[PDB]
Write a protein that binds this ligand. Structure first.
Ligand SMILES: [Zn+2]
Lengths: 55, 95, 225, 104, 101
RNA sequence: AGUGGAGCCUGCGGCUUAAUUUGACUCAACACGGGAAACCUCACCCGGCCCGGACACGGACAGGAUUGACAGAUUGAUAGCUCUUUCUCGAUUCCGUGGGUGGUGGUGCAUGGCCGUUCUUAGUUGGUGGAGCGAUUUGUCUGGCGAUAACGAACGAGACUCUGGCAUGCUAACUAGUUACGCGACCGGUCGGCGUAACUUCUUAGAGGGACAAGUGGCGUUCAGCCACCCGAGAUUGAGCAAUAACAGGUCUGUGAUGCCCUUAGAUGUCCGGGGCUGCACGCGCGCUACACUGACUGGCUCAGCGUGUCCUACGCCGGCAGGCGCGGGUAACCCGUUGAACCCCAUUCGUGAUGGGGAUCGGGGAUUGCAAUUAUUCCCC
């Protein structure tokens, strides 16, 4: 479509304007502390960031 | 797509050999192409056409395309912009 | 104007993750081990840990220049703030993340799974490790997906010790019929001063010093000194 | 050897200023090189005459060393439940009767 | 030149408290009135995920925990000694924020 | 103490619907899929739009291959989407041929990874010695001291790491205070009200100590243990990680992890508009509020900790109420915040009745959130 109608809707709020910064998915996202990763992607990189499971 | 955008892609590729992306059809203007008004979508398709032709090397990493210059692809932009061979990119400047 | 330390140390860990992912993506056929970011406000110095430093540098240093331009352009920090330095890993055998990629290279090279796995197993047993396991699972023989395991040396599976002793490394090899997962867990030694393993002794292993066999008394002797 | 509690001879050590003397730090590196024994052979076609060479150093088709090594290498491609081990690191010459029993 | 503040902050104390003594030692060698290193409280970042990717099992959860130890050390000196003390004792994983007055 | 019995919130089926996507069905599915979905999400239904067909070959193409577009018809759409009206655009192409991409399309009974389960079990494997030609046996132990061809390991269990408990000893504190001395205020006192000198008790967080069946006495093949008392802060909390072997357990719907198959341009790729996921005769669950006098209504008095914060808010004014304004602080033990929570305590009223308990069900206005609240988003009050 043309530019007036191709993105006619505002993607400024809600889960559609929020995607995981690794897997681009819109379910199971964590945005606390500005992670913006998926709940399945964060468990892969938790140690690499440096989260340690203490209790 | 206009030829002005297609030419506007091919400059920054020659100097350093690196062009990036974000994979967003929806987002309208690419940060590195300042005051040239080239959508990132055209960057994606112009370097995807070069990917099947073997002029760039792709390496997808966390929603970011990374593009490269092949050895044979050096001479391809030297025919498009007609850049004479005594002008070297940033590949062989230092050391 | 800065963001909070909570959102800073998080965003620093996300930076050290994407660089490592990208370097793995490119150099999986190089002998890549890891990232070492040292943050200096003049220039951030990133040390590549790889076992063949010549091919990651490429001919005349061409590859390192293009990828340092990549890491310049991606992360948005200004030019003249990145310094990439490839460096040889001290022991290729003990770094299981590098070693769980060379086995993947062999399985891509057409080798039989058992021959390459035993080669990797014996090289890391010989390299100075106290024990290791290599697990290949998937389509090994036909449509049914079986499993293999190569256990030798000693191993520990529970407790804090595991964190600084084994090096769990999981990789996926992409064959014509499917994917095989490879899990290399190398139990490092107690190398104290050594940078081969962690100085800390295993939480249970205790060493008792033998007695310095002193002189049995014979006669009360007063010696002036 | 592997006991958790251990006995230490720290008392009987006389002198050791240079602990890291360059004697035991020999960089063992043979995996990615061509000194790896665990590499493909790049096979040669079998000669039609049934042997290789002339004179007196004729290594024939039915050589016990080559046939045994080929039997072990053929044993390496068994089913996953079958336990093989590391018969390539040490030199095995596995005969046809033994290998045929195992293969069966 | 008074109330210059140095903020050492890292993720684990075994490198933080190591260089914490490497900075207070130079000031005593240079004979500077310095306050003791005060321990601004260790903030614990807590993220509790689900272990499964599916929504299937016994509904078992992870407990991820990141600790940040905050330290403040105070010195009252012209700001030229500050760079020659802090710049030498550089440690990986330990960041040195600094304010002047 | 409950659920099952009441009303209702949300997941399941059955039923309708164009769709009421779907995965999951004993514990090992059913407030699970971070799944509290107005658009997005979103896959599903209806309608419309675009190519984002990379690349290579053949044809067409500059005397144009084309793209975009005012006005009218049509259209939900200032959708050149198609026609009329003819204005733009300079190979950036177009048509077929191969062939790559794109899929939240199908197989989790083709895979990886991760997870769950058996099992939070109490087992698992090796080495040496002796018996037997061998399969095998002893170890991996008969007994109620004593026999004792057996002895040692390793993983698991413990140890460990984190957390709770103790330190008037150490290290320090204007981003926590305390003590004192002045200033002020009101009746020697109270001040979270004001500032400099004492210090780390309180508050912080580092090191190091502290508990190891500890001690004593009774009961026990006096054995592993049990009971009483003492020293004590503690005679010990709560987690995390978790062997060996397995399930044809769950997940292509988390991924640019994925083999094939399908779809690939009147598209299963996008995007956009409206719906649906929430319907409603009925059964199955997790749960909230209740059935009241140990209660409710109305005042006053009140004391936390874990944490978040650019969206958290303080403070004055306007409006009961939600909320607006006007300004300030806070990227953080500095500001919200001395975090002045609720159960609770003290007074009034109601008195065993479908009652003022309990609030479902409905009609109104009123205020924010956001393009848009009608299928009541939420919140106020009748
Ligand atoms: Zn996440």
């Amino acid at each position: 479509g043309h530019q007036q109608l191709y993105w006619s809707h505002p993607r400024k709020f809600g889960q559609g304007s929020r995607s995981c910064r690794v897997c681009s998915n819109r379910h199971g996202l964590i945005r606390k502390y500005g992670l913006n990763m998926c709940r399945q992607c964060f468990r892969q990189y938790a140690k690499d960031i440096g989260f340690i499971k203490l209790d | 797509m206009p030829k002005k955008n297609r030419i506007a892609i091919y400059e920054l590729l020659f100097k350093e050999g690196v062009m990036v992306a974000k994979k967003d059809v929806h987002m309208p203007k690419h940060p590195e192409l300042a005051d040239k008004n080239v959508p990132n979508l055209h960057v994606m398709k112009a370097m995807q056409s070069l990917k099947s032709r073997g002029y760039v090397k792709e390496q997808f990493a966390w929603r970011h395309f990374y593009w490269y210059l092949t050895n044979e692809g050096i001479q391809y932009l030297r025919d498009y912009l007609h850049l004479p061979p005594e002008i070297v990119p940033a590949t062989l400047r230092r050391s | 104007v800065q963001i909070s330390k909570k959102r800073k140390f998080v965003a620093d860990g996300i930076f050290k993750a994407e660089l490592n992912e990208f370097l793995t993506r490119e150099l999986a056929e190089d002998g890549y081990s890891g990232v070492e970011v040292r943050v200096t406000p003049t220039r951030t110095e990133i040390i590549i840990l790889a076992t063949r430093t010549q091919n990651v540098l490429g001919e005349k240093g061409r590859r390192i220049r293009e990828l340092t331009a990549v890491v310049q352009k991606r992360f948005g920090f200004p030019e003249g703030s990145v310094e990439l330095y490839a460096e040889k890993v001290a022991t290729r055998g003990l770094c299981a993340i590098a070693q769980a990629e060379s086995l993947r290279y062999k399985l891509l090279g057409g080798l039989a799974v058992r021959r390459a796995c035993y080669g990797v197993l014996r090289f890391i047993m010989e390299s100075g490790a106290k024990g290791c396991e290599v697990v290949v699972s998937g389509k090994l023989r036909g449509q049914r997906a079986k499993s293999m395991k190569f256990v030798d040396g000693l191993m520990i599976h529970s407790g804090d010790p595991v964190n600084y002793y084994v090096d769990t490394a999981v990789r996926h090899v992409l064959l014509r019929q499917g994917v095989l997962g490879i899990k290399v867990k190398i139990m490092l030694p107690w190398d104290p001063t050594g940078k081969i393993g962690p100085k800390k002794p295993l939480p249970d292993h205790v060493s008792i010093v033998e007695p310095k066999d002193e002189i049995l008394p014979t006669t009360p002797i007063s010696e002036q000194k | 050897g592997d006991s958790k509690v251990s006995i230490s001879f720290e008392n009987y050590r006389k002198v050791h200023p240079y602990e890291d003397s360059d004697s035991s730090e020999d960089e063992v590196d043979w995996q990615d090189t061509r000194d790896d024994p665990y590499r493909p052979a790049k096979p040669v076609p079998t000669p039609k005459k049934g042997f290789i060479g002339k004179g007196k150093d004729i290594t024939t088709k039915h050589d016990e060393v080559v046939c045994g090594r080929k039997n072990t290498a053929r044993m390496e491609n068994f089913a996953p439940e079958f336990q093989v081990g590391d018969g390539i690191g040490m030199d095995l010459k596995l005969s046809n009767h033994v290998f045929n029993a195992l293969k069966q | 030149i008074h109330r210059i503040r140095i903020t050492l902050t890292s993720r684990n104390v075994k490198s933080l408290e190591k260089v914490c003594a490497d900075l207070i030692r130079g000031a005593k060698e240079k004979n500077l009135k310095v306050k003791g290193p005060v321990r601004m409280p260790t903030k614990t970042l807590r993220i509790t995920t689900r272990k499964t990717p599916c929504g299937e099992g016994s509904k078992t959860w992870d407990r991820f925990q990141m600790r940040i130890h905050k330290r403040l050390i105070d010195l009252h000196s012209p700001s030229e000694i500050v760079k020659q003390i802090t710049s030498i004792s550089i440690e990986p994983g330990v960041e040195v924020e600094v304010t002047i007055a």
